[PDB]
Amino acid sequence: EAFCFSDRFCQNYIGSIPDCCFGRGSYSFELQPPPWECYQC
């Protein structure tokens, strides 16, 4: 599963959860990713 972040710019990682985006944050396939991997929710 992708790494999930609560904040838009993948600053706050909240673990990798099945729901992933509880809020409209971001997620990525790399914990603290490059700009292009910082996929917003």
Ligand SMILES: *C(=O)[C@@H]1CCC(=O)N1
């Ligand atoms: C998530 O994309 C992958 C698939 C299983 C796991 O633990 N990570």
